[PDB]
Amino acid sequence: LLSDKNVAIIGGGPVGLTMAKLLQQNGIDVSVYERDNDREARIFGGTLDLHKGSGQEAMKKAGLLQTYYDLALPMGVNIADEKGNILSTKNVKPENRFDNPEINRNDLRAILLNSLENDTVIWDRKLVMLEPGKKKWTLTFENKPSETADLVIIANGGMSKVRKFVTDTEVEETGTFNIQADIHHPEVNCPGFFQLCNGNRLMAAHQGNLLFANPNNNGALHFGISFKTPDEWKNQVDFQNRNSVVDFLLKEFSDWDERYKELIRVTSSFVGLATRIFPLGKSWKSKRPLPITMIGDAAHLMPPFAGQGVNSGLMDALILSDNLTNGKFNSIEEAIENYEQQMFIYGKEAQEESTQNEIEMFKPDFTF
Ligand SMILES: Cc1cc2c(cc1C)N(C[C@H](O)[C@H](O)[C@H](O)COP(=O)(O)OP(=O)(O)OC[C@H]1O[C@@H](n3cnc4c(N)ncnc43)[C@H](O)[C@@H]1O)c1[nH]c(=O)[nH]c(=O)c1N2
Numbered sequence: 001l002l003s004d005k006n007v008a009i010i011g012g013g014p015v016g017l018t019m020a021k022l023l024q025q026n027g028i029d030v031s032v033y034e035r036d037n038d039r040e041a042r043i044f045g046g047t048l049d050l051h052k053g054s055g056q057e058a059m060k061k062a063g064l065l066q067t068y069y070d071l072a073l074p075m076g077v078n079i080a081d082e083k084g085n086i087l088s089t090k091n092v093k094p095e096n097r098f099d100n101p102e103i104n105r106n107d108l109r110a111i112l113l114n115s116l117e118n119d120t121v122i123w124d125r126k127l128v129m130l131e132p133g134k135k136k137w138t139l140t141f142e143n144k145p146s147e148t149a150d151l152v153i154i155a156n157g158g159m160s161k162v163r164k165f166v167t168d169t170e171v172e173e174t175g176t177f178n179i180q181a182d183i184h185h186p187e188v189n190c191p192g193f194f195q196l197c198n199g200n201r202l203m204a205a206h207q208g209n210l211l212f213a214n215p216n217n218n219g220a221l222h223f224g225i226s227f228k229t230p231d232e233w234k235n236q237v238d239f240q241n242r243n244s245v246v247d248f249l250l251k252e253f254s255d256w257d258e259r260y261k262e263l264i265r266v267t268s269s270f271v272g273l274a275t276r277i278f279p280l281g282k283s284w285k286s287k288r289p290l291p292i293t294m295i296g297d298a299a300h301l302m303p304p305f306a307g308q309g310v311n312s313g314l315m316d317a318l319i320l321s322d323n324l325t326n327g328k329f330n331s332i333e334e335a336i337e338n339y340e341q342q343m344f345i346y347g348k349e350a351q352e353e354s355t356q357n358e359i360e361m362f363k364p365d366f367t368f
């Protein structure tokens with residue numbers, strides 16, 4: 001199918017890099033175009049864990065499952081209330097230690113980058129436009145020379161603006177909002193909350209405000225505070241202004257234990273982000289001018305609160321890469337169609353669980 005042809009993957013996130021590995025290890029000529037300036041760019045966010053049957057199956061097929069295991073950390077979960085009482089402690093039993101250990105996102109990028117041949121990823125390449133030719137796409141990048149490919153795979157995340165050859169679907173806001181931050185040396189800077197986590201991830205919910213924390217993301221504490229988007233914000237917190245963010249959060253958390261307030265007070269900077277979804281519904285465009293598809297969040301971005309996210313994208317890469325290389329399809333288009341039909345099933349399943357969970361967890365009286 002791909003002999004004497006080449007593949008362009010747009011985006012070097014965990015899904016795109018996994019895509020590249022699974023193609024390249026079957027002898028496919030594939031490049032990844034990534035907007036990040038270079039591989040040393042820090043990725044902001046919590047940890048990821050990979051699941052048996054999906055994310056771990058993609059690593060296994062790439063020969064990287066042990067590498068993931070060696071850099072990942074099994075973590076228990078504590079459920080606390082707003083007063084700081086631990087309502088539930090579930091540690092990881094040894095027989096479950098491979099189920100879904102947490103890995104830092106930069107560590108995961110490094111594993112995948114190290115598995116690829118040199119110069120597979122072309123850095124500082126922000127795709128802005130695609131144009132189909134007779135047999136090859138032309139790729140236009142921001143202030144860089146163009147490239148061509150027989151097959152384009154869109155893998156550049158939930159806010160991709162290069163989707164229109166595949167679908168007219170637009171991303172949507174779901175109505176919840178997320179504030180995220182890191183605390184370095186949390187054992188010094190938020191000792192009370194750090195000891196509350198006690199090596200476990202911690203979650204707590206009270207009157208429509210949700211808090212989730214990881215006390216040990218490669219030595220830092222990552223936490224997220226989520227809530228229904230305030231109506232006053234429709235169409236007011238400047239997240240560049242930590243003093244404005246601290247003031248808002250301290251009002252929201254006014255009846256939470258001081259160990260939670262300390263987290264807010266000592267945070268150096270905050271990142272805010274509306275929850276969004278790229279909804280799978282009616283089929284994507286049929287009879288596209290040249291072969292093109294999408295994987296990962298570009299295909300099915302969904303709320304993250306129940307753990308859906310990267311694993312459905314890693315499934316995409318596993319399925320699409322097998323269809324493109326197993327010699328069973330008469331054309332790249334047919335291989336793509338088969339992947340998309342499968343992804344519509346498990347992707348819709350995951351989106352409905354994520355949306356249902358979001359409705360439930362943000363009811364004003366929810367508790368874990
Ligand atoms: C607050 C919060 C919390 C979580 C999560 C989301 C959010 C918002 N998720 C979701 C999860 O992290 C997500 O599913 C994966 O990052 C998807 O990876 P992708 O590679 O598809 O896109 P991702 O967005 O990770 O990567 C896209 C890549 O494309 C690049 N790019 C963008 N535009 C480009 C362009 N024009 N040209 C070239 N490159 C371009 C970007 O720089 C980036 O490297 C999650 N999931 C999970 O499984 N477990 C979890 O715990 C969480 N937690």
Ligand SMILES: CCCCCNC(=N)N/N=C/c1c[nH]c2ccc(OC)cc12
Binds near residue numbers: 178203225306
């Ligand atoms: C299925 C195994 C778990 C993997 C990831 N699992 C997860 N739960 N990722 N969560 C992200 C998140 C962002 N903001 C929040 C606010 C509240 C909250 O409560 C759980 C969670 C979040």
